[PDB]
Structure formats: C-alpha cells, structure tokens
Design a protein around this ligand. Structure first.
Ligand SMILES: COc1cc2c(cc1OC)[C@@H]1C[C@H](N)[C@@H](c3cccc(CF)c3)CN1CC2
Ligand SMILES: COc1cc2c(cc1OC)[C@@H]1C[C@H](N)[C@@H](c3cccc(CF)c3)CN1CC2
Ligand SMILES: CC(=O)N[C@@H]1[C@@H](O)[C@H](O)[C@@H](CO)O[C@H]1O
Ligand SMILES: CC(=O)N[C@@H]1[C@@H](O)[C@H](O)[C@@H](CO)O[C@H]1O
Ligand SMILES: *[C@@H]1O[C@H](CO)[C@@H](O)[C@H](O)[C@H]1NC(C)=O
Ligand SMILES: *[C@@H]1O[C@H](CO)[C@@H](O)[C@H](O)[C@H]1NC(C)=O
Lengths: 728, 728
C-alpha cells in the first residue's frame, strides 16, 4: 500500500543521499561547506569558525564554480567560467582573493582559458598551464615566469596530459608535481605530433548552419603513440630576464629501446623523485629513484636503486603499476604488488636493496594504502568475512607485522561493510565513509586510540522518507563454477516471493578488474525496475573481474570478449535454474564495456536471452585507444595478437542477432568510444538483414549525461524492457 | 486470386515490369539490347540486325558498365571501373574499340578516373573531363588537346558541375555542349573557392581504423554561392604546338549586377547559341542569343535578341526556366511560359521581336515540347479529360494553331492515360510508352500518317502472373476545397468493402511542383501495405503541387511549411469523413521534402494522426542548399525572408510530438539533406522530453538505396506501421 520507487523518483532525484565532503588543512582542522559558507572545523573538539562567508562574492559578478585555498592560508583561488573537456580536463578563468585583506588582486591575473592551476604544497606559489605552456607565480600579485615555450595546441603538451594519458594513465588533466618543499616543479611533456586524429561532427545549437568537425589526437589500437619527456625546474632560482632552466630526467635504457609510457610520479623527499615507466607491452615496468645533486644542479637516477616489476600472467598493476608510499626519510617505501599466489598485497622495499618483504598475505587483496606514519600503515582490504565486495580499513604495527587491527569492521556490521577513508596530515584523525549496504554513514575518528568522536552525516532524513516507499532489497552471494566462487548481486522486488516467477535483467559491465557485486547502497535505475516493475536486476562478477587474485583477473589476458562473455551466460543459465526467475523473460544490458559484452552475449546464440540493450559499446578492439586495449590484448599485428583482435568483434556475430531483440544506443559526440563503434555494429546487422532498434543522441558523449539526455535514454530503455517483458 | 503481394515481393523484384529501351541512331534506325546483344532495328521495315555480339567482349578482362557508339558508327566507347559520386556524377575508366577494324585502341588511352566523356553529335571527336580539366580528341588513336589548365579539385570545375549545379540546376555532371556541327565545344566553368564545406564522417569497411571525413563544397541557404563563367572553343583550329584559345561569353549586364546562375545552354545553329541566366532572387531570368563572328573569332550577343522572363507571383519556371526549341534556320523558337492566367503553355518567339505568341491555351499545361519539324510541333500535356495526373502526346499544325490532334488519347483509353514519347532524329518515327493506369505498353509509330506500326513490349508475361495475385486497385478522384479542385489518389485493398473501416497511411511528398496523384502504375511498398495488410495508402496534391497552373503552385511562394502542410491535414480530415476510414488509425510518412512535411504535420497538434515516419527530412531551410531554398524562400536576411525561415522549422514544433508516435530515419553519408537535419530534430525532441524511435543507416546517402539497406529500411518501417495500427 506504500508508494513505489518510480522512474520519476530516480530521474528527478527525489530521494537524495547526503554527503559530507571535507578537506583536511592541517593535522587537526578541516574545511567544509555549510549553507554556502566555507567553515573550518577542529577535529579534536568539534567547534567551527567561518572561513569564507557565504555572502562574499555576491557582488563578484560571476557564478563561482570551485574554490582553492593556499596551503598557508592567505589567498583563495576562485575558479569560474568552467568549460569541460574530457573526463578530467576543463578550461576556466581564475581570480585571486587576498584574504589578509578585503581585496581581489587585480594586476597580473591568471589568464582566461587556463588549462590547470595548482598551489604549491606549502605557502602560496602558483603553477598554471595556459596554451599548453607552464608558468609560475611566486606571489599572487606579481608577474609569472614562463617555464616552457614549446607548447602548441594538439601537438605539444607541457604540464597537462593529452587524451590517452588523461583517460588511461593519470585519470587527471594535470601533469604537474610540486616537490613537498614547493622548491622544485616537476612536469611531464607529451608530443602528439604523429598521433592520428579521430574526427567527428558536433551539431550544437540550431543556429550553427554548418556542423563543426572535432579533431582529437587519439591513438587507436596499434597506432603511433605520443612520446614523453620528464622535467624538473628549480622554482627558487627563476630570473625575470633569463629563461628558466628545466633539467630533464631520462627514462631508463631498458625503456628507451622502444615505445613506453610514464606511469607514476611520486616525490619521496625534498630531493628525491620516484618515477615509474612502463613498456608499451605492459609486461615490464621500472621504477627509477632520482636524487638532486647540490653540486651540479642535476638529477641522478642510480641504476643500483632501479626496481623492476613484471608479470608472467598478465599486465602490471590493476590498471597501472601501483604507487609507492615512502617513509619520512625516503630510504624505503611500501607498494601493492601481486604475490606468488596471485594476490595483491603490501610489500616493503628498501631503496638500495633488490627484493621486497610482504607485509600482508592471504586469500584476499589489499585495495589501497591510505596512510603511513612511523608506527602504523593504514590500508583498505576486502579481507572481512572473505567478501571480495566489501571494503574495510585496517592498521598494521610496523614494529610487528602480525599485529593487525581492523578499524571499521565492527563499527556497524549490518549497516556498514563498505568503507573508504580520509586522514588528516600525519594521520592524527580520520574520516570514515560508510557506503553500504545500509544508508551512507560518515564518522570522524581519533587515531591515538581509535575512539569515535562524532557522527558527521547519518542520512536519517533519507531514512524517514524511505520508510514510506516500497524499497527493493539486495542479495549478495556466490555460485561455484569449475570449483571457484563467483559472486553475484540481486536486486529483488519488495515483498519478494520465492514461489513466484519474476523477469530478470542481467546488469553487466564485466571489464577487466571490474566488480559489479558489492555491498554498496545505490539509488539507480535498477532500484526502479524492481520497486515498480517487479524486475529482478542481477549482476555477476566472472572471470577477468577484480580484487580476487590474478587467477581470476588475468584469465582474460590476451583474450577479451571470451571468458567474461561465457561467464555472464552461465550466471544467467544458473539464475534460470533457481525457481523464482521466469526463463522466458531474461534481458541483458550494459554500457561501454557493458555494451560490448551485452552485444557479445546477444550475439552468442545461447538462446538464453530474449532481448538486450547496449549503450555506447566497443564493437572491435582496433577501434578503442592503445593504452587500454593493448594492456589486455597486445598489438593487433600478425606477430602478436591480430588473430584474436579479429575474432572478438561484435560484427562477426551479426547473424545470430535475429534470435533476439536488440537496442543500440550511442551519443554522436563520444570522444571516448567513438560513434564509429556502433556505426559498424548497425551496418553489419543491416548487411545480414537483422532488424533491431537504434537511437543516436545528438552531441552527447560517453556519459550521455546532459540532464535531458539522461532522462531520455532511461525513459527510452524503460519502455524497451517493459515491452520485452510484456509489462503494462 | 489467393496469393498476396508481399513485402518480400517488393523487396526481391518478384514481379518485374518489362521496359523497352532504344536509342535512336538516325531518322529511321535505333539500337536495342535484348539479353546482352546490341541490335539495330529498322523503323520503316521492322527488320533488324545484330550490331554487336554479346560475346564480343569475353576476353576484354573488365566487367563493362556501359557503351557509347559514335554517331558515324565507327567506334564504340566502353565504360568500366564505375564509381558513383552524387545523384548524376561518377568516375570511370574508358577504352575505345574500333568497329571497322576489330581492334582495341592501345595508344593515348583515355585516362583512368575520368569524370565525363562524350562523342560529338556527328563524327567521332571526343571531349572528356579529367582532374577538372577539359580535353579533346580529334582521332581516337591520337594525342589529346588540353583545353583548360585552371582545374583544381573542389575549387575550379571546367566542363563539369559542382554539387549545387549538378543537383539543383542541370541535373547532370556534364557541363559540355558541342555545336551540332562538332565544330565548337562550349563549356561552363565553376568557382567554388569561397563556398563553405559540409563535413561528415564516412566509416567504410570494418577494416578502416579511423573514419574518413568527406568534405564537400555546398552552399546552404544564404551562403556564398559558386561563380560561373562560360567559354567556347573552336575544335577545328587546334594546334599541337600552340595552346587552345577559349573565347568567353559573359553574362548580360542585367545579371552581372549581383549573384546569378547559368541556367540553360541550348545550341541554335552551327554558329548560334542560346544561354539562359537566372538572378539569385530567382524571379528574373534572361535569354541571350549569340552568333559566331566568322572573321574576328569572337561571339556576340546583341541586346536586341535578349529575352526577359520574370514572375510576379513566384519564381521563374517549374524547377528552372524552360528550355528553348529552335527551328532549323535558328531565327525563332518555341518555349513554355506561364501565361496571363497562370498556366504553362507553348509560346512562339521570333529572335528579334518583342513579346511572343501563345500557340496553346486553356486550363491545363504543356508538360514539355518533344520535337519540331517544318509543319508540326509535338508536345505532352495533361489536357485530356480535364485531368492533371494524365499525360498525352499532341500535334500542332504550325500554319494553323487551332488544328490540335491528340496522338495518344484514344489509342487504349482504359489501359493508358500516362504517356512519354521518344522521337527519331528528325521525328520521322516515335516510340510511345505508357505507364498506366494499366501495365506499361511500348508502341512504335511513324510520324507520316500517325500509323501505329508495332507493339514493342506489352508486359503480357507480367499480366498473367498478376491475375494470380490479390492485387489492389487505384482510385484517382478529387475533392473541392475552397472552390478549387485538388486531386488525390487512393491505393485500395483487394476485396474492398465500403462499409468496413480501414486504417489509412497518408503518403506525402508535397514539394513545390510535385504531383502524387497520377495515373501511373506502380509495384511498390504501398502495393504491399494494401495487398497484404489491408491498409489504404492515400496521397494528396494540395497547394504547391504543379501542373495545375500558378494559382496553386505559387500559393506556397516565400512560405514553405505553411499551406502544403495544412492541406495534407485537410485531406486526411476529409478522408476521415468518408465512411471506409477508421479515424483512430491514420498515419503519415515521407522521404526528403515528404519527411519535412510529415514532421510538420506531426508537430502541428492537429490531433488527426496516430503516428508518422520521416526519412531524411529537411528540418530547417538554412540547412538545405541555396539554389533550391532561395527559389522558394528568398534570402535568410532580416530585410528579406528571415522571419519565415525561422517560423518553419520542425524543431520549433517539438513540444507537440508528445501526442504521436514518431519514427525518424536518416543515412549518415547523406550529402544532400545532411544527417545534421535529423540530428537537430532528435536533439529538440530530447530537450523537450518527447519519446520517439530512431534509426540511422551508416554510410548510406539520401536514397538509402544499397540493396541491404533498402530491404532493411522498408522492413523496419513495416513493423512500425503494423504495430501502430494494431496488426499482427
Ligand atoms: C582505478 O583506476 C582506473 C579505473 C578505471 C579506468 C581507469 C583507471 O585508471 C587509469 C578505466 C578507464 C577506461 N577508459 C574505461 C573505459 C571507457 C570506455 C570504454 C572502455 C572499454 F570497454 C573502458 C574503463 N575504466 C575502468 C575503471
Ligand atoms: C524536373 O526537374 C526536377 C525535379 C525535381 C528536382 C529537381 C529537378 O531539376 C532541377 C528536385 C531536386 C531537389 N534537390 C530534391 C530535393 C532533395 C532533397 C531535399 C529537398 C527539399 F526538401 C528537395 C527534390 N526534387 C524534386 C523533383
Ligand atoms: C576552527 C575553530 O573554531 N577553532 C577554534 C580555535 O580558534 C579556538 O582557539 C578554540 C577555543 O576558543 O576553539 C577552536
Ligand atoms: C580560376 C579562377 O577563376 N579562380 C579564381 C581566383 O583567381 C580568385 O582569386 C577567386 C576569388 O574568389 O575566385 C576563383
Ligand atoms: C615532437 O616530435 C616530433 C617528431 O615526431 C619532432 O619533430 C618535434 O621536434 C618534437 N617536438 C618537441 C617540441 O619535442
Ligand atoms: C533490313 O534488311 C534489309 C534487306 O536486306 C537490309 O538492307 C538492311 O540492312 C536491314 N536493316 C537492318 C537495320 O537490319
């Protein structure tokens, strides 16, 4: 008799999850936004002052998009005129408000259309990139020093990443790294000179008489890649009428032999930088440790302290080689490395030494190292109750590795099984963040004894509202295939009845190192399909999926669109053999890799599925970018992996599609997985005479996420599934 | 008759209409291809010979796409390596084969990738266009003479047409015109330097890693048009030492004022040429008559013989100024003109004299003038039975205009109401060819006493098959709207029953000077929908339709998307009132102009239609080309017609679509109505929250004509209509 969770609810965001986003500023204080004021909180004691009043910048004259405060709290960056580029990149204008004053600084502004800006870690230095060149401001009201002069649109990138690096390597537009002193500005430089361009139409507003052609350097599988150089400049010795001296750091000779990438830049100390490089064949990676020479003003990367990481079974790292966390003195670090068994654990490295010591071990994985002090290392793992889909915060005594405390496990075991954390400087305090399976809970904790201090946000407003709606529930369990556990989740309709036969939607991503079965609380489309349409929405984590060792994750190595595909079919077959699913009403849908697999399934002939929706699918690996594809597939050459590059296309299975109802969707402005991918799927389905359904989305990219397109695609998909399942 | 006409029947060409394609080669002889041999028939004696054996080119080694026999039957052109460009343009390889000797010409072969070749109308000279330049060959085995040197890809076109001229002016790739002598080669030269480029992606075979960007000079409404220059070259005076002196004929001073077009090129005598020119505001045109000046070498156009053709109510001509037909001596001509009551009749022009004399009159129009002799002019009109959708050959005595004989009206009055004709060189014999309402009937005649000579193909084979098929029947009637007659046709299901209530698909095109209500016999998609699905397919010829005089055609002037839309709604509203129509099941669909009108109807909020289909619709006139658009719309400037350009978009009506079910389809390589047009529609619909269906056809142009795409689109549209009308 209660109201149901409707498509409108989802779409108009009727029930919002509350968050508590803070930024640690010291060892003991953080910044937080309350009713549009910026507040400072004291962690120990809970009291707050107003840092920046809401009503300041009422007469500023521009809508303010973000803020950024100098480490040494004298200035604030006001970001405005944000215009998005790709996933991380954007262009904006900037002003500086001088805080120890009433005033915006008016001389020597950061240019309009700046590509990236950063404060140094200490004081108030600024580094920014504008027109692909680096600049440095020692003082907010003084002129900038030009660090680089080679910048050119689409060709040379100084201190920002190009398209593949943004997307596939740094997950960041920025390629600037200040030393912890603020003394040295390290930076990468990318050269896209010979990198082929993907081109596509942008239609824009009606008034645009002629369509624009967007041209983006984008190395497809096997094409010419960008090249990299690394540089470190001394920020303390810049001259106004002498050009700045950038000292280059050369990649290791074992990388310079052929094509390679920069992977990681981590400062170790005031005079030591850590650099990881990875070979185009993502088999082999090297970490270089480089010290600054006070004599020659040069950097020296002693071959003696180089570190190597290879994999016999797949590629290095989860998506890239993991980052090292150095001890205060910089002579040793910790790093997540896959062990002999295939499980990702914490290894202790010493700088001038050759092997590493494993600090954790077991039939589970460390997800990330979050903090390091002289006494403990803090990490997040899925160790608790052997649930790969859970996440908890642990703590190790470094005096003794066997002495391990779980810090979040027993806090709220029913509500809370999916943590992430955020420590203050030197880890005096941490904010725990519970993500499910109950409602998100945010707490603040004190490290000295691990005593809880304060609940920060408990989403009790949402709980009150949710009591009045017929919410679905979540099953998280596993099946056994050829003697191995493989988890799935089920979003079950309210008042579920095990004797009744429900329609089932298989929700797939299934890309490498993915996890679709976890313990987080979500309000999404699947919430609606269960609460209102009584549809079971199922996800399954099969071979190739992450966080359960390399035996599972790498199964897929050099062979995408293979085991991950068969295994979604099997999960389906098996969900079928439980008594509460109507085996005449099983759909499948996914987005991105999700659309590829959905497409490869629908094209398998299993006869298991009635219909499926693919949104923005990869159709052929030679269409996707090089860093991603080659990481799992090698090069598409007859001496490497051409053969399976060809066997694993959506196109090759066109015939089989006559057995199923197919909905194909793609935004026309997809820089990521180009419209071409769906273009070739539809053309091949046409060539064979297979009817299917389509929908392009003008000027939308990979997220199809503009407000109206978001509502449209979900409405469209709701109809298609409702009609596939014969639901009113 | 048990078996029904299937969607498969239309798609697979189960019921072939036979045709009879001859090419006259003198006054008394013609060539015909029967199976794969070339046969010459005698028209006087009926007897025949084999000209060219089918097996003649067995060991040639290229699949021949076409032949062209020279006027003196000495040589044959062989066309292979055919690649289509636009509607008329294409590139090909050519050989010449000496017929007298039985040899291949090896020396000085016409180059690969030729854009156009043509014999002279007499003898065996060749003019061809390669890489945008004109070449001439006196002897098929001799070095060619380079006429022009200025030709540059997408910029300068010598003797061929750019995109707009091809599609909207000459309906040809060719821009060459030999004098009847074979002495003179005249050619136009087009300048696209400043014409903006339409840019779209082409995806090609799967194997193409990166999509290609096709770039085409295409002036949209209001943009910078190409420029035109006209030249004449003396073929007889060419030197292999010196260069070719081309002599320029420039436009009239009344043209050179602003933007203009070279409208028409019609030779008069061996030494006289007629040119028409059209102003950019296409309501003013001018005919220039130009004589060769024996001794000086130039060409001269006396302003005395200049003839003005303008319009007060619309544009000049049907799609252009009509073509002149000269009498042997070349001092006079006949040409169709709108008369003081707005109907299109033949006029007698004497070269030096003011006005012209009308030789035909009445409330019908002459469709075309087909031949001229000393004593008679033959023409085609829709006079018979006061019927605009009919077409009949007539005869007019020149020494007495009141002696009008209908050569065809009575020949087969129930089977044939729609003829076209093909006279011999000097009109001694003509092949009539009728297209309906019954099956196509091809008959030869002698002009002398208009004696019926022979039956050439009568489609008897097809006739028997069809008795075995539950054929639909065509009803071609009219309705009185204001106090005017607007014609409609109706395709009716077999065993039609005037008391049962049928679903109706309103078939629409309705572009200016269109006619969808006629007496043609068609085996098409409307045939299958009526035969198999018992849907009525109606079409209506409302305001803007042609062949009924300017009072109807020009109603739409400076005003597209208004009257021609309101009238289609009206039509269906009337069709509703007729008791055989189920008024909850009316659909509309259309291609090109049709798609725009369908969309505008669907967006009108009339309440009459349940669903529509729109294929490659125009959506906004600023997106379609200048030549066609400004003809009907004027310029998109505030001081001309910008307001109505803006009041007539599909986009602005978007809200209204929540009321109907919309299927919108477009090919991504449509160089004509650019994909852009639907892209902007889709985006409007998304912006306003309206669901609809969509389908793109990748790499298909405006016709969506490739056999797999063609079969695909009608299959897809079938299901759509079937489901809209609740039919299994
Ligand atoms: C922890 O870090 C990372 C996580 C993740 C990504 C990258 C990451 O770091 C580079 C990649 C980036 C990649 N571009 C994404 C994508 C988008 C479109 C199409 C495909 C292929 F199907 C893949 C998939 N994700 C998975 C999640
Ligand atoms: C007897 O001659 C001619 C007839 C006709 C045409 C041209 C003709 O010759 C110039 C025009 C050419 C025009 N380009 C076509 C078209 C194509 C796409 C979009 C639109 C606008 F909606 C219009 C329609 N047709 C109608 C039939
Ligand atoms: C962020 C904040 O409010 N900090 C205050 C601090 O300034 C003050 O000294 C103390 C006691 O008054 O309480 C805390
Ligand atoms: C061969 C030819 O006529 N080309 C001309 C070029 O000389 C001129 O500069 C341009 C200006 O639009 O027009 C084009
Ligand atoms: C980038 O690389 C190209 C060769 O691909 C080279 O010619 C050019 O000098 C390089 N530019 C810079 C500034 O490194
Ligand atoms: C018709 O036959 C006659 C009689 O032999 C011959 O002169 C002539 O070539 C023939 N015409 C054709 C076109 O075959």
């Amino acid at each position: 008799s209660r109201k149901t969770y409707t498509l409108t609810d989802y779409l108009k965001n009727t029930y919002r999850l509350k968050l508590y986003s803070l930024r640690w500023i010291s060892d003991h204080e953080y910044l937080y936004k309350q009713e549009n004021n910026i507040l400072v909180f004291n962690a120990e004691y809970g009291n707050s002052s107003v840092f920046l009043e809401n009503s300041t910048f009422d007469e500023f004259g521009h809508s303010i998009n973000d803020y950024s405060i100098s480490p040494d709290g004298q200035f604030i960056l006001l970001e405005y005129n944000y215009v998005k580029q790709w996933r991380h990149s954007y262009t904006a204008s900037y002003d500086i408000y001088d805080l120890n004053k009433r005033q915006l600084i008016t001389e020597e502004r950061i240019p309009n259309n700046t590509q990236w800006v950063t404060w140094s870690p200490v004081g108030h230095k600024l580094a920014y990139v504008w027109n692909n060149d680096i600049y440095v401001k020692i003082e907010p009201n003084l002129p900038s020093y030009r660090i680089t002069w080679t910048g050119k649109e689409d060709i040379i990138y100084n201190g920002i990443t190009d398209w593949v690096y943004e997307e596939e390597v740094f997950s960041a537009y920025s390629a600037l790294w200040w030393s912890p002193n603020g003394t040295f500005l390290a930076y990468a430089q990318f050269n896209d000179t010979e990198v082929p361009l993907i081109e596509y139409s942008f239609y824009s507003d009606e008034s645009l008489q002629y369509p624009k052609t967007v041209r983006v350097p984008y190395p497809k599988a096997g094409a010419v890649n960008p090249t990299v150089k690394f540089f470190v400049v001394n920020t303390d010795s810049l001259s106004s009428v002498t050009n700045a001296t950038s000292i280059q750091i050369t990649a290791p000779a074992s990388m310079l032999i052929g094509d390679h990438y920069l992977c990681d830049v981590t400062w170790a100390t005031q005079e030591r930088i850590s650099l990881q490089w990875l070979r185009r064949i993502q088999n082999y990676s090297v970490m270089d440790i480089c010290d600054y020479d006070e004599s020659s003003g040069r950097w020296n990367c002693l071959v003696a302290r180089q570190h190597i990481e290879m994999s016999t079974t797949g590629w290095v790292g989860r998506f890239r080689p993991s980052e090292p966390h150095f001890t205060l003195d910089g002579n040793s670090f910790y790093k997540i490395i896959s062990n002999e068994e295939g499980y990702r654990h914490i290894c202790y490295f010493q700088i001038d030494k050759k092997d590493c010591t494993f600090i954790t071990k077991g039939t589970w994985e460390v997800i990330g190292i979050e903090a390091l002090t002289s006494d403990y290392l803090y990490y997040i793992s899925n160790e608790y109750k052997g649930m790969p889909g859970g996440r908890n915060l642990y703590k190790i005594q470094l005096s003794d590795y066997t002495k391990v405390t779980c810090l979040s496990c027993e806090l709220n075991p029913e509500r809370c099984q999916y943590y992430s954390v955020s420590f203050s400087k030197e880890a005096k305090y941490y904010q725990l963040r519970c993500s499910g399976p109950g409602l998100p809970l945010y707490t603040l904790h004190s490290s000295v004894n691990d005593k809880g201090l304060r609940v920060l946000e408990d989403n009790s407003a949402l709980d009150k509202m949710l009591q009045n709606v017929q919410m679905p529930s979540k099953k998280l369990d596993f099946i056994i295939l050829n003697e191995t556990k493989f988890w799935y989740q089920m979003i079950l309709p309210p008042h579920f009845d095990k004797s009744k036969k429900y329609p089932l939607l298989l929700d797939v991503y299934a890309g490498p190192c993915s996890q679709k079965a976890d313990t987080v609380f979500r309000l999404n489309w699947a919430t609606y399909l269960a609460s209102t349409e009584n549809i079971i929405v199922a996800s399954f984590d099969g071979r190739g999926s992450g966080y359960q060792g390399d035996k599972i994750m790498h199964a897929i190595n050099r062979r995408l669109g293979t085991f991950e595909v068969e295994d979604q079919i099997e999960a389906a077959r098996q969900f079928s053999k439980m008594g509460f699913v109507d085996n005449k009403r099983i759909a499948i849908w996914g987005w991105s890799y999700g659309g590829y697999v959905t497409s490869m399934v629908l094209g398998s002939g299993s006869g298991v599925f009635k219909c499926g929706i693919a949104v923005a699918p990869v159709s052929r690996w030679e269409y996707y970018d090089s860093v991603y594809t080659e990481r799992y597939m090698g090069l598409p050459t007859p001496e490497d992996n051409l053969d399976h590059y060809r066997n694993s296309t959506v196109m090759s299975r066109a015939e089989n599609f006559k057995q199923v109802e197919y909905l194909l969707i793609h935004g026309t402005a997809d820089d990521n997985v180009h419209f071409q991918q769906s273009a070739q799927i539809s053309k091949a389905l046409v060539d064979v005479g297979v009817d299917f359904q389509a929908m392009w989305y003008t000027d939308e990219d990979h997220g199809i996420a503009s407000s109206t397109a978001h509502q449209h695609i979900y409405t469209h998909m709701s109809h298609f599934i409702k009609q596939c399942f014969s639901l009113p």
